[PDB]
């Protein structure tokens, strides 16, 4: 731990050094700060090459302009920067934008290995699709996103066999809102233009809100704020959206120019938050190409800052940021506007709302044939064996194992015979994959693929089980719904832990959904599995409130079992819901040992969930504490192995239902259907996301 090369006195740098984890990161923080301290890191003045007195703002509107047929159509290089699990939606969007004359270059976040493997299958099928061999961890707001674009531009310019004319960036949450023919016709008419959208406000305020006057450093997948810095003199600084369309001539300039402007701006934006929202605007407006700028990025972005500005990236960057919302069906009319030209839109998420995606795709390229299956369903992989059980948690590993056993028990009881039961199985190994299953924008549960020995013939078989959670919400007031979960998304107003999977060390959150009406106050009560009252509080429901949520401070660990949450109005019952805190069978992915199970499953470290007690409420609410059940709960806390599995599966079976189970290959169970012939399996046909042979018109859709 060597000291720094200079005295470090800035409050922001000392905070970053105290929070940094790796030695390599603390060292790089120190070097950056000390270089900036001596005035050797950032440029102070920059040459402006644009001959214009200010901005250009070229104009582009008649809807009939897009109907002509060009003799020399542009060929487009699409750069897809993607992450997450939504491979089937990316495949659907890729289908909509594909043409054999364009090119597709796909960067997958280093941390998204499952999605990368799925993208490799696409690049292997088509000669005009390639994947970036390098892969960065493009955190939100990171400096690395500009490095990604710049490197991808250099790569594309050196690909001599790909003669492209325009550069377009897209995420897995974008979708087209006009046909490929209309896009090509428009860009063929304006092929010497560049399309970037500016903020549209006071420029001095834009600089401060973006933190452009602050020095940032990306290290350990975090953006550290290290102090202040001056805006360079002599140039106009601008910015806005980091979704754009740039012609090849300007990309060449950015990549290969060695003039004062491009050199110093690449250094400046190496230490900048949200760099792609400002670097390309600032270079273009001050370069010799300034007179090619159109103040329109041809996108509709669904900004709703009342919901999207919650400083939800504070754990990733030393700043507050905002994000666009997902479109919903009521927004479809916004795609048909003709005020200005627009060809893409964001954001779309199939786990949030797929109906609007369907409306848009059929409006552009027509309905699928009658009888096409899976059009209203959605499947999303959330665990894939190649990534290993250590990428799961002890909670999800424990519960995925229990769901699989629940399916094997369904197989056994579904056969009615008086002889040997050829549907008895013994589980083998760990789950092979897990999918989320949605139907008509309603969550249906989990699909678990797993291996098991058919005991009658003594042969291994591969199966998929569908488990669905039991309904537990039970009601002229305003209350519409109530739910307990974790990872609450304040922008989309939903829990991202879709199944509500919880273990004893989780900190649950209670949510309520309200309809319109006069302001009211209600009482919330949390009850643990042996009727111990853990917390109570009132909350004001204002006449405009739509969602309320709160995370009570409950001492850990939580007693395992079925908890209850009650809502009252001046002692009058209103509604209640239930949730499961499951006991764990794994510890660091290993079978849990007695000493570990007893410390984790016997209730909080202290004898109480909060300092304040509520024992006086058990009689008023008719929640007597049974001495017998308390003793048994302590007995359960000490169990392991077989006894613990029976306790867990008893609890899961009371909150989840095994809806069906299928075999992926040959099977000896006579009542088992083949997965490819079901309507729900991840093996069943899903033509809207399937990619086949190129058609005579050069399309896949």
């Amino acid at each position: 731990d060597q000291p720094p090369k200079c005295d470090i006195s800035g409050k922001e740098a000392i905070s970053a050094l105290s929070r940094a984890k790796s030695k390599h990161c603390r060292q790089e923080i120190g070097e950056t700060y000390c270089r900036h301290k001596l005035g050797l890191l950032m440029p102070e003045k920059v040459t402006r090459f644009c001959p214009l007195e200010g901005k250009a703002n070229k104009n582009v509107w008649d809807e009939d302009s897009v109907e002509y047929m060009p003799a020399n159509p542009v060929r487009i290089a699409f750069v897809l920067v993607v992450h997450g699990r939504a491979s089937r939606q990316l495949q659907r969007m890729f289908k909509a934008i594909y043409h054999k004359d364009h090119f597709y270059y796909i960067h997958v976040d280093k941390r998204s290995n499952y999605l990368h493997r799925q993208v490799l299958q696409v690049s292997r099928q088509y000669s005009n699709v390639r994947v970036t061999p390098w892969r960065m961890a493009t955190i939100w707001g990171g400096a690395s996103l500009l490095s990604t674009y710049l490197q991808s531009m250099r790569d594309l310019l050196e690909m001599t066999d790909w003669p492209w004319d325009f550069f377009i960036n897209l995420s897995a949450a974008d979708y087209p809102i006009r046909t490929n023919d209309q896009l090509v016709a428009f860009l063929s008419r304006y092929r010497d233009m560049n399309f970037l959208k500016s903020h549209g406000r006071d420029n001095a305020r834009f600089i401060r809100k973006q933190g452009l006057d602050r020095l940032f450093l990306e290290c350990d997948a975090h953006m550290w704020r290290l102090g202040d810095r001056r805006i360079p003199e002599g140039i106009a600084v601008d910015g806005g959206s980091d979704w754009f369309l740039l012609n090849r001539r300007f990309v060449e300039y950015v990549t290969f120019s060695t003039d004062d402007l491009v050199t110093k701006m690449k250094q400046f934006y190496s230490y900048t938050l949200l760099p792609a929202e400002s670097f390309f605007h600032t270079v273009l407006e001050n370069s010799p190409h300034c007179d090619t700028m159109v103040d329109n990025n041809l996108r509709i972005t669904n900004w709703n800052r009342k919901l999207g500005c919650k400083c939800q990236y504070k754990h990733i960057v030393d700043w507050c940021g905002c994000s666009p919302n997902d479109f919903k069906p009521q927004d479809f009319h916004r795609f048909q506007q003709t005020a200005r030209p627009t060809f893409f839109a964001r954001k779309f998420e199939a786990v949030v709302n797929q109906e609007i995606i369907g409306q848009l795709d059929y409006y552009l390229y027509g309905n699928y044939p009658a009888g096409t299956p899976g059009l209203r369903s959605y499947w999303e992989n959330v665990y894939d064996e190649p990534d290993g059980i250590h990428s799961l948690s002890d909670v999800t590993l424990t519960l995925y194992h229990s769901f699989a056993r629940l399916g094997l028990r369904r197989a056994e009881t579904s056969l009615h015979t008086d002889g040997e039961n050829s549907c008895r199985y013994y589980p083998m190994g760990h789950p092979a994959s897990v999918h989320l299953y949605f139907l008509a924008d309603r969550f249906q549960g989990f699909l678990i693929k797993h291996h098991a020995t058919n005991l009658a013939v003594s042969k291994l078989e591969t199966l998929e089980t569908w488990v669905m959670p039991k309904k537990v919400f039970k009601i002229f007031g305003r209350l519409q719904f109530s739910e307990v979960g974790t990872d609450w998304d304040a922008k989309e107003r939903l829990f991202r832990n879709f199944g509500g999977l919880l273990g004893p060390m989780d900190e649950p959150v209670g949510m309520q959904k309200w309809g319109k009406g006069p302001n009211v106050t209600v009482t919330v009560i949390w009850v643990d599995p042996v009727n111990v009252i853990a917390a109570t509080y009132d909350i004001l429901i204002e006449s405009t409130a739509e969602f309320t949520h709160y995370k009570p401070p409950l001492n850990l660990p939580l007693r395992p079992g079925v908890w209850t949450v009650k809502i009252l109005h001046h002692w009058v019952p209103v509604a209640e819901t239930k949730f499961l805190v499951a006991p764990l069978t794994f510890s660091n992915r290993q079978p849990i040992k007695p000493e570990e199970a007893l410390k984790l499953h016997n209730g909080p470290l202290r004898n109480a969930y909060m300092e304040q007690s509520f024992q006086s409420l058990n009689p008023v609410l008719s929640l007597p504490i049974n001495p017998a059940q308390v003793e048994q709960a302590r007995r359960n806390a000490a169990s392991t192995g077989t006894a613990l599995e029976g306790w867990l599966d008893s609890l899961v079976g009371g909150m989840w239902t095994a809806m069906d189970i299928c075999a992926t290959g040959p099977t000896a169970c006579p009542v088992m259907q083949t997965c490819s012939q079901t309507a729900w399996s991840s093996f069943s046909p899903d033509p809207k996301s399937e990619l086949g042979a190129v058609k005579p018109d050069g399309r896949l859709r």
């Binding site: 959208k197 500016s198 903020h199 549209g200 809100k209 980091d242 972005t301 900004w303 700043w319 507050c320």
Partner: peptide, 11 residues
Amino acid sequence: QEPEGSGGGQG
């Protein structure tokens, strides 16, 4: 319709 820019200030 709305302005662009994802930065929301220091906090």
